[PDB]
Design a protein around this ligand. Structure first.
Ligand SMILES: CN1CCN(c2ccc(NC(=O)c3n[nH]c4ccccc34)cc2)CC1
Length: 299
């Protein structure tokens, strides 16, 4: 039996379970409506994402979901992270209730707003479109959320655009920052979408399994490269073995088109071979804040 925590407990009948959002082994995510989540009124419905376990789920899968919930409790609230909203822990399956981000992950969000398909792409007529000031703003918000997490002593370890979520009002929220330990990462495994996670990893994290905030800043570099190529895939066609060798030689990704030199030097700085020489999230937040204000939105 799980102990109740009246800070977070929502009665079960206050939650109407809706359509799935996400799969699978790592815990199913469904859309729901919570009645009367907040103090008052109890008469208002909030759309939430609810995390749960699947059918043939183990005790270890249960243990991880709890740990991720408790971790969110300790970390506290920020505008640029997926916040914990509630939990149903008693008399049934465990539900962890978290903020809903209705535009999905940043990679998807970036890809969907790419300019229309030409003869040589071809009918990708998006309904929506991001200026240069919008793109630097995405980076500012992710850096803000990361700075907040680092100040709470949290190391993400898998920062990437797939783990940044986008709300209906276009606010970036970092997801998956409370996920459990896991000495057992296999470099060969892919994402659903076909990409290798080793490609956001700092060399020291990759080779010596040293995970720090500095290593997260390495991942934010690649995230910056993802925002500025509008969801471009890092090192496409490069297998893990060849990636090892590009890292060893000090290879660094090319500068995206429609990226200022200043922003590309930011990427490069984040990718400094020496971890102590990278900027901090605090420095990146100051820098981006300045650049945003100077970045024209007219294009
Ligand atoms: C056509 N697309 C429309 C957008 N769509 C979509 C929209 C929203 C979400 N959101 C989520 O899955 C989500 N929102 N908050 C979360 C907290 C933890 C884990 C997941 C989440 C996922 C996918 C994907 C399909």
């Amino acid at each position: 039996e799980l102990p109740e925590d009246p800070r977070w407990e929502l009665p079960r009948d206050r939650l109407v379970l809706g359509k799935p959002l996400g799969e699978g082994a790592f815990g199913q995510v469904v859309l729901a409506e919570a009645i009367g989540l907040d103090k008052d009124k109890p008469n208002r419905v909030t759309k939430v994402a609810v995390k749960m376990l699947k059918s043939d789920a183990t005790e270890k899968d249960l243990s991880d979901l709890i740990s991720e919930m408790e971790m969110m409790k300790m970390i506290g609230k920020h505008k640029n992270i997926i916040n914990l909203l509630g939990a149903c822990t008693q008399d049934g399956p465990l539900y962890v209730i978290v903020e809903y981000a209705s535009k999905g992950n940043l990679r998807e969000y970036l890809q969907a707003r790419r300019p229309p398909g030409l003869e040589y792409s071809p009918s990708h007529n998006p309904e929506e479109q991001l200026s240069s000031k919008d793109l630097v703003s995405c980076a500012y918000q992710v850096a803000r959320g990361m700075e907040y997490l680092a100040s709470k002593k949290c190391i993400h370890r898998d920062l990437a655009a797939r783990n940044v979520l986008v709300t209906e009002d276009n606010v970036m929220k970092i997801a998956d920052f409370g996920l459990a330990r896991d000495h057992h990462i296999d470099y060969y495994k892919k994402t659903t979408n076909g990409r290798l996670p080793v490609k956001w990893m700092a060399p020291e994290a990759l080779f010596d399994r040293i995970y720090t905030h500095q290593s997260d800043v390495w991942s934010f570099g690649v995230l910056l490269w993802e925002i500025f190529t509008l969801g471009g895939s890092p090192y496409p066609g490069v297998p893990v073995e060849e990636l090892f060798k590009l890292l060893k030689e000090g290879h660094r990704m090319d500068k995206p088109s429609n990226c200022t030199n200043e922003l590309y030097m930011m990427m490069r700085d984040c990718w400094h071979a020496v971890p102590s020489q990278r900027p901090t999230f605090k420095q990146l937040v100051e820098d981006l804040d300045r650049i945003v204000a100077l970045t024209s939105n007219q294009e």
